[PDB]
């Protein structure tokens, strides 16, 4: 039933890993149209019987935050633009406007009297203001993950259902860096009939409109019969603006842009001022437009025309809606009645562009192409390609992972209960989820925004993070607290979240140390949840004020424990060194959690006076010339010193980590008898260009290939211990540690770039892997893709987003980096990984930005890395666009994003604790996730709703029998069920109403959403 997405390549017209390897890239001056050359059209070729249709589509480019926050842009312009839109619409029933923003949009609407709101409601029941995507924002598609791109689409378009009564089928993204197939992907399991994209290669754009392919049905990867097609319309030119709209020439488009004439304080650039249609100059403004039109309509099937019409914060002025409408429709009256052009001109909205290019295909006037692959990485002219921003402000973009998973853990642990009002748990989801979608816009995730604009994203994300942690700490609180002793003060704190990784160590000291002692509090509870739906053990860490604590289960069951010191690291600028500095008052437990499906788990620690039974000691090694002392004080192992050394390291059955004398890997054993594999790790630097163009917020220009950085005689922490060993080092910038548990290594950098202007820091892997010129990167964290480091393109165009994962493989060996945080990276020769950690650059890049990147501050990037056999499984042919992960590196991409979420119980006694919640949800098969779990009514809903996304990858066959799974039926999670229907993925139609109530699983690859219906 399902189809098979490794062995059939599917055949497309156009598949773009093919078109780049045949493409020339050659970037010639084409005339007028500088990307281009100069197009010729038969002037026969529209007549009486077939005229050239053309849909002007007004519109306005907002940005939830650019050079001014969200609120500066709302309050400046876009409440203007708006209430400008809606009097202007109201007054002029022909004139039309389309709409991307909801973010903005909502904030306009809940400021309106009920009678304006009831002005707006008809003017989009009649059509003229028709929503585009509907999205909460117009997200990046490189850095933003799947699941993000999906709650901010379905947060604009539960709004738009809820308070306008529509729902987009058209999509509008004019302006992400690039494109990915995870929008079409993501839109057409949404109910969307139709997509438009915009920046796209230069080259790309050339080649696709010699061959008349801007419009095709754009597929996945790996979809050999085409059922994920989605119709997709890329324009053809430089800019969405009027000069790059009318036609192939901005010098005459430029005219046609009414707000250029000089009291709004614009011009035309090409020195040719619009100027008013009369009577007396409407015929030759008319050929010189219509001429633009059937220059831009060669490159297109149909004779349907689209001509958008607008550019930033446009429709803002009264005066300039005037402007362009009375101009427009001066135009309009001469075009359409004067035969001999053979065109029929008016205001459109996109959905009325698509419809009627629809029914021509009908018709049997046009057949479209098929295409699959992306459209990373963009250069908009010459070498300028954008792979900066896969990088840039790294702090955001690992901020945004961790709000992301915060959203889905508190989103499903209160969806487990209906909750009074008075706990204000809708209210509190609602702000982080509205926070976190915001920074998906294109400005936000991306680091192209003003300094302070970054400093309002940052300030809403940690709001949201504030949110998230009420919620959970609140259901957890109920969860495990026998029914009739649960007494909630809905503001209260029951349990604080503790994270080791967010915002990390050397970030902030953010992490409360659990305080224990004979004559205060002898023990404390913890509870470990668990979003993912399988049984999961993680090792989990917690502070403590006594290195002499022991873990128990909540049946007394002792839990085998290590403790650690906690070690921080410090610029010496009194030694000139970086070095580790250990704490007297606080040590590090570290143990197995183990917790059910999308459920909870309870630990206790207990203090006693010694060394307690199940608890072990790691030993300390640190490796410098002219060691001091470090006292630990109670910790019962004294650290012991050495000169630099190569060092090897093994946890459990793990394998054998072998580090040089600078504290970086150099080498991976599998097992045993296997051989050890060359694996280094290596920090270099990447500046910037002394003449010709700089890198910037958005610009990756290198001057050459990376240089190492020079590590000089770095100080090498050891820590050995029978749960968790870590070799840490502080190098220039970065303080580089491998942790070991057993499994392949997690790698975290403190990442401070410090002052060092001008400066990218990279990290480097090098293999003996004969990759040759081939990897693979993900996409949004939902796929991956095949690519071709190609020699005639330069550095920064081999740049890629890795927004969570990214391997080399022969036919033998494989290597997957797997990260946190979504940053740029490459293969720039055979055998090697690579990935940027920061940038500082000095200079703006010549994009509106205006401003370099000089806000960095310490990020605690975080990875695994797991090197395979791979020469056993079953791979897709030479040929096939994409790639898969296998069990361990999709468990490992899993550890970094979704971890257990940890919470210590605030007050010294937890009446009515419970050990556990969730033990008989089924646990499902690996590659299964349920990837949002969200209640859908409030309480006083009689039928009580739950949306469930349920989202399946694919995994390699490697030969693991691996077998024995429980069905995940998610309709029955909750008690009293009534219906069960198959939806839309924003829950906003029903698709199938479901046999038995029964939610069947989905096929590898494929997402669903269900809602289960609850009499309650
Ligand atoms: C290259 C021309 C400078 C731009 C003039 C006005 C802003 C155009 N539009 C803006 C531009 C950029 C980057 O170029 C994006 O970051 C914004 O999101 C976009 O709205
Ligand atoms: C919502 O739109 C539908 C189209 O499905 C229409 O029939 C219905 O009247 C609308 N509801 C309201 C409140 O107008
Ligand atoms: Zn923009």
Same mark, same amino acid.
Request: proline share 6%; aromatic share 10%.
């Given at each position: 039933?399902?189809?098979?997405?490794?062995?059939?390549?599917?055949?497309?017209?156009?598949?773009?890993?093919?078109?780049?390897?045949?493409?020339?890239?050659?970037?010639?001056?084409?005339?007028?149209?500088?990307?281009?050359?100069?197009?010729?059209?038969?002037?026969?070729?529209?007549?009486?019987?077939?005229?050239?249709?053309?849909?002007?589509?007004?519109?306005?480019?907002?940005?939830?935050?650019?050079?001014?926050?969200?609120?500066?842009?709302?309050?400046?312009?876009?409440?203007?633009?708006?209430?400008?839109?809606?009097?202007?619409?109201?007054?002029?029933?022909?004139?039309?406007?389309?709409?991307?923003?909801?973010?903005?949009?909502?904030?306009?609407?809940?400021?309106?009297?009920?009678?304006?709101?009831?002005?707006?409601?008809?003017?989009?029941?009649?059509?003229?203001?028709?929503?585009?995507?509907?999205?909460?924002?117009?997200?990046?598609?490189?850095?933003?993950?799947?699941?993000?791109?999906?709650?901010?689409?379905?947060?604009?378009?539960?709004?738009?259902?809820?308070?306008?009564?529509?729902?987009?089928?058209?999509?509008?993204?004019?302006?992400?860096?690039?494109?990915?197939?995870?929008?079409?992907?993501?839109?057409?399991?949404?109910?969307?009939?139709?997509?438009?994209?915009?920046?796209?290669?230069?080259?790309?754009?050339?080649?696709?409109?010699?061959?008349?392919?801007?419009?095709?049905?754009?597929?996945?990867?790996?979809?050999?019969?085409?059922?994920?097609?989605?119709?997709?319309?890329?324009?053809?030119?430089?800019?969405?603006?009027?000069?790059?709209?009318?036609?192939?020439?901005?010098?005459?488009?430029?005219?046609?842009?009414?707000?250029?004439?000089?009291?709004?304080?614009?011009?035309?650039?090409?020195?040719?001022?619009?100027?008013?249609?009369?009577?007396?100059?409407?015929?030759?403004?008319?050929?010189?437009?219509?001429?633009?039109?059937?220059?831009?309509?060669?490159?297109?099937?149909?004779?349907?025309?689209?001509?958008?019409?607008?550019?930033?914060?446009?429709?803002?002025?009264?005066?300039?809606?005037?402007?362009?409408?009375?101009?427009?429709?001066?135009?309009?009256?001469?075009?359409?009645?004067?035969?001999?052009?053979?065109?029929?001109?008016?205001?459109?909205?996109?959905?009325?562009?698509?419809?009627?290019?629809?029914?021509?295909?009908?018709?049997?006037?046009?057949?479209?192409?098929?295409?699959?692959?992306?459209?990373?990485?963009?250069? !908009?002219? $010459?070498?300028?390609?954008? =792979? &900066?921003?896969?990088? %840039? *402000?790294?702090?955001?973009?690992?901020?945004?992972?961790? #709000?992301?998973?915060?959203?889905?853990?508190?989103?499903?642990?209160?969806?487990?209960?209906?909750?009074?009002?008075?706990?204000?748990?809708?209210?509190?989801?609602?702000?982080?989820?509205?926070?976190?979608?915001?920074?998906?816009?294109?400005?936000?995730?991306?680091?192209?925004?003003?300094?302070?604009?970054?400093?309002?994203?940052?300030?809403?994300?940690?709001?949201?993070?504030?949110?998230?942690?009420?919620?959970?700490?609140?259901?957890?609180?109920?969860?495990?607290?026998?029914?009739?002793?649960?007494?909630?003060?809905?503001?209260?704190?029951?349990?604080?979240? !503790?994270? $080791?990784?967010?915002?990390? =160590? &050397?970030?902030?000291? %953010? *992490?409360?140390?659990?305080?224990?002692?004979?004559?205060? #509090?002898?023990?404390?509870?913890?509870?470990?949840?668990?979003?993912?739906?399988?049984?999961?053990?993680?090792?989990?860490?917690?502070?403590?004020?006594?290195?002499?604590?022991?873990?128990?289960?909540?049946?007394?069951?002792?839990?085998?424990?290590?403790?650690?010191?906690?070690?921080?690291?410090?610029?010496?600028?009194?030694?000139?060194?970086?070095?580790?500095?250990?704490?007297?008052?606080?040590?590090?437990?570290?143990?197995?959690?183990?917790?059910?499906?999308?459920?909870?788990?309870?630990?206790?620690?207990?203090?006693?006076?010694?060394?307690?039974?199940?608890?072990?000691?790691?030993?300390?090694?640190?490796?410098?010339?002219?060691?001091?002392?470090?006292?630990?004080?109670?910790?019962?192992?004294?650290?012991?010193?050495?000169?630099?050394?190569?060092?090897?390291?093994?946890?459990?059955?793990?394998?054998?980590?072998?580090?040089?004398?600078?504290?970086?890997?150099?080498?991976?054993?599998?097992?045993?008898?296997?051989?050890?594999?060359?694996?280094?790790?290596?920090?270099?630097?990447?500046?910037?260009?002394?003449?010709?163009?700089?890198?910037?917020?958005?610009?990756?220009?290198?001057?050459?290939?990376?240089?190492?950085?020079?590590?000089?005689?770095?100080?090498?922490?050891?820590?050995?211990?029978?749960?968790?060993?870590?070799?840490?080092?502080?190098?220039?910038?970065?303080?580089?540690?491998?942790?070991?548990?057993?499994?392949?290594?997690?790698?975290?950098?403190?990442?401070?770039?410090?002052?060092?202007?001008?400066?990218?820091?990279?990290?480097?892997?090098?293999?003996?892997?004969?990759?040759?010129?081939?990897?693979?990167?993900?996409?949004?964290?939902?796929?991956?893709?095949?690519?071709?480091?190609?020699?005639?393109?330069?550095?920064?165009?081999?740049?890629?987003?890795?927004?969570?994962?990214?391997?080399?493989?022969?036919?033998?060996?494989?290597?997957?980096?797997?990260?946190?945080?979504?940053?740029?990276?490459?293969?720039?020769?055979?055998?090697?990984?690579?990935?940027?950690?920061?940038?500082?650059?000095?200079?703006?890049?010549?994009?509106?930005?205006?401003?370099?990147?000089?806000?960095?501050?310490?990020?605690?990037?975080?990875?695994?890395?797991?090197?395979?056999?791979?020469?056993?499984?079953?791979?897709?042919?030479?040929?096939?666009?994409?790639?898969?992960?296998?069990?361990?590196?999709?468990?490992?991409?899993?550890?970094?994003?979704?971890?257990?979420?940890?919470?210590?119980?605030?007050?010294?006694?937890?009446?009515?604790?419970?050990?556990?919640?969730?033990?008989?949800?089924?646990?499902?098969?690996?590659?299964?996730?349920?990837?949002?779990?969200?209640?859908?009514?409030?309480?006083?809903?009689?039928?009580?709703?739950?949306?469930?996304?349920?989202?399946?990858?694919?995994?390699?066959?490697?030969?693991?029998?691996?077998?024995?799974?429980?069905?995940?039926?998610?309709?029955?999670?909750?008690?009293?069920?009534?219906?069960?229907?198959?939806?839309?993925?924003?829950?906003?139609?029903?698709?199938?109403?479901?046999?038995?109530?029964?939610?069947?699983?989905?096929?590898?690859?494929?997402?669903?959403?269900?809602?289960?219906?609850?009499?309650?």
């Amino acid at each position: 039933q399902c189809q098979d997405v490794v062995q059939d390549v599917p055949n497309v017209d156009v598949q773009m890993l093919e078109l780049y390897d045949r493409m020339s890239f050659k970037d010639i001056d084409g005339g007028v149209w500088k990307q281009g050359w100069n197009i010729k059209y038969d002037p026969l070729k529209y007549n009486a019987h077939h005229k050239l249709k053309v849909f002007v589509v007004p519109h306005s480019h907002n940005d939830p935050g650019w050079i001014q926050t969200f609120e500066e842009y709302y309050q400046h312009d876009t409440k203007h633009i708006l209430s400008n839109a809606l009097r202007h619409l109201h007054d002029n029933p022909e004139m039309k406007f389309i709409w991307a923003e909801i973010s903005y949009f909502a904030r306009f609407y809940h400021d309106l009297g009920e009678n304006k709101k009831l002005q707006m409601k008809s003017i989009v029941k009649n059509g003229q203001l028709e929503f585009v995507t509907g999205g909460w924002v117009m997200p990046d598609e490189a850095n933003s993950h799947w699941r993000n791109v999906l709650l901010q689409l379905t947060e604009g378009q539960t709004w738009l259902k809820q308070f306008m009564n529509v729902t987009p089928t058209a999509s509008w993204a004019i302006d992400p860096f690039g494109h990915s197939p995870t929008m079409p992907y993501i839109l057409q399991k949404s109910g969307f009939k139709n997509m438009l994209i915009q920046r796209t290669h230069y080259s790309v754009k050339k080649e696709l409109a010699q061959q008349r392919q801007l419009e095709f049905l754009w597929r996945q990867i790996w979809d050999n019969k085409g059922d994920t097609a989605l119709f997709t319309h890329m324009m053809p030119f430089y800019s969405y603006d009027i000069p790059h709209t009318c036609g192939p020439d901005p010098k005459v488009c430029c005219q046609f842009d009414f707000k250029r004439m000089g009291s709004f304080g614009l011009s035309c650039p090409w020195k040719v001022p619009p100027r008013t249609i009369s009577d007396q100059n409407v015929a030759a403004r008319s050929d010189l437009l219509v001429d633009q039109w059937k220059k831009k309509a060669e490159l297109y099937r149909t004779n349907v025309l689209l001509i958008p019409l607008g550019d930033d914060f446009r429709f803002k002025q009264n005066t300039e809606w005037d402007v362009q409408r009375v101009n427009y429709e001066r135009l309009f009256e001469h075009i359409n009645s004067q035969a001999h052009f053979n065109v029929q001109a008016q205001f459109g909205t996109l959905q009325e562009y698509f419809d009627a290019v629809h029914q021509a295909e009908r018709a049997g006037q046009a057949e479209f192409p098929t295409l699959s692959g992306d459209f990373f990485t963009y250069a !908009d002219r $010459s070498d300028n390609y954008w =792979s &900066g921003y896969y990088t %840039s *402000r790294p702090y955001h973009k690992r901020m945004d992972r961790v #709000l992301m998973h915060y959203v889905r853990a508190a989103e499903m642990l209160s969806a487990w209960h209906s909750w009074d009002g008075m706990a204000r748990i809708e209210e509190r989801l609602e702000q982080a989820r509205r926070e976190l979608s915001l920074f998906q816009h294109h400005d936000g995730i991306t680091g192209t925004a003003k300094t302070h604009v970054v400093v309002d994203y940052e300030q809403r994300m940690q709001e949201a993070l504030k949110a998230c942690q009420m919620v959970m700490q609140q259901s957890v609180y109920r969860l495990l607290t026998k029914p009739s002793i649960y007494s909630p003060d809905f503001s209260f704190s029951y349990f604080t979240l !503790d994270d $080791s990784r967010w915002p990390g =160590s &050397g970030v902030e000291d %953010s *992490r409360t140390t659990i305080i224990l002692g004979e004559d205060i #509090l002898p023990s404390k509870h913890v509870v470990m949840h668990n979003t993912l739906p399988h049984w999961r053990e993680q090792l989990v860490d917690f502070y403590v004020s006594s290195p002499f604590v022991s873990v128990t289960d909540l049946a007394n069951n002792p839990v085998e424990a290590q403790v650690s010191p906690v070690w921080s690291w410090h610029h010496d600028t009194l030694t000139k060194t970086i070095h580790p500095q250990g704490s007297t008052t606080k040590y590090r437990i570290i143990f197995k959690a183990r917790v059910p499906p999308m459920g909870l788990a309870t630990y206790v620690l207990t203090i006693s006076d010694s060394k307690p039974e199940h608890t072990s000691y790691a030993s300390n090694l640190l490796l410098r010339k002219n060691p001091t002392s470090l006292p630990l004080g109670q910790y019962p192992e004294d650290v012991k010193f050495g000169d630099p050394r190569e060092i090897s390291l093994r946890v459990g059955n793990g394998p054998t980590l072998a580090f040089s004398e600078q504290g970086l890997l150099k080498s991976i054993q599998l097992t045993q008898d296997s051989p050890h594999v060359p694996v280094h790790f290596k920090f270099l630097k990447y500046g910037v260009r002394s003449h010709g163009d700089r890198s910037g917020a958005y610009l990756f220009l290198p001057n050459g290939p990376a240089s190492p950085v020079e590590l000089g005689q770095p100080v090498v922490l050891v820590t050995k211990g029978k749960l968790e060993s870590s070799v840490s080092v502080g190098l220039p910038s970065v303080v580089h540690q491998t942790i070991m548990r057993g499994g392949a290594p997690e790698i975290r950098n403190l990442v401070d770039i410090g002052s060092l202007d001008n400066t990218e820091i990279v990290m480097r892997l090098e293999t003996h892997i004969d990759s040759g010129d081939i990897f693979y990167t993900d996409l949004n964290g939902l796929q991956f893709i095949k690519r071709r480091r190609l020699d005639k393109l330069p550095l920064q165009a081999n740049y890629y987003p890795i927004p969570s994962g990214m391997f080399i493989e022969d036919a033998n060996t494989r290597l997957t980096l797997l990260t946190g945080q979504p940053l740029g990276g490459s293969s720039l020769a055979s055998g090697e990984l690579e990935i940027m950690q920061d940038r500082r650059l000095a200079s703006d890049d010549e994009r509106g930005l205006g401003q370099g990147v000089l806000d960095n501050k310490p990020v605690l990037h975080i990875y695994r890395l797991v090197l395979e056999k791979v020469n056993n499984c079953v791979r897709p042919s030479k040929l096939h666009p994409a790639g898969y992960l296998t069990s361990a590196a999709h468990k490992a991409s899993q550890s970094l994003l979704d971890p257990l979420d940890k919470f210590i119980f605030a007050e010294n006694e937890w009446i009515g604790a419970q050990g556990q919640f969730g033990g008989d949800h089924p646990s499902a098969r690996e590659d299964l996730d349920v990837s949002v779990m969200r209640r859908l009514t409030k309480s006083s809903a009689k039928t009580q709703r739950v949306g469930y996304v349920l989202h399946r990858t694919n995994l390699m066959q490697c030969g693991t029998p691996e077998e024995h799974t429980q069905k995940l039926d998610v309709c029955h999670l909750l008690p009293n069920v009534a219906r069960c229907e198959r939806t839309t993925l924003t829950f906003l139609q029903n698709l199938e109403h479901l046999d038995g109530m029964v939610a069947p699983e989905v096929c590898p690859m494929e997402t669903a959403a269900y809602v289960s219906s609850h009499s309650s």
